Inclusion membrane protein A
Amino acid sequence: HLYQDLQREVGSLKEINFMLSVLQKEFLHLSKEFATTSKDLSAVSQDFYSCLQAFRDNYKGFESLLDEYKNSTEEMRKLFSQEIIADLKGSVASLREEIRFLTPLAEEVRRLAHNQQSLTAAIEELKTIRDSLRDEIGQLSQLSKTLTSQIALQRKLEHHH
Ligand code: NA
Ligand code: NA
């Protein structure tokens, strides 16, 4: 019931992995389209590729962590503290909300540029989203890395049985 509870809360990680694959390329494309129009917008759009790639690099690790929680022992669950579970839930929820904001901005920038409108607010929003995603994907990455290492060490120390 704990695993079915957290899994419901976090949702499909594969869905996030796929959507970030789509969006990282959409924004690399945008970065090439505007290289000679807005240096500033091109730079932030290019930044999004590596920012989103960090989640994909860690995707197998995140799925593995969820599986470990699914098959957890009484000793393993102590590593899954309430603080850590809350951090997992809140960073994944943050990713989903940020993606909701990020998705329409590529076309919005294309539309603004066509009608010669100011790109300032779009660039500011893209910078804010990039920084937020960097923070949350990095927190998720570190959380998963630490927990998996702790689980491995606990199992290694149980090997004597
Ligand atoms: Na596309
Ligand atoms: Na968090």
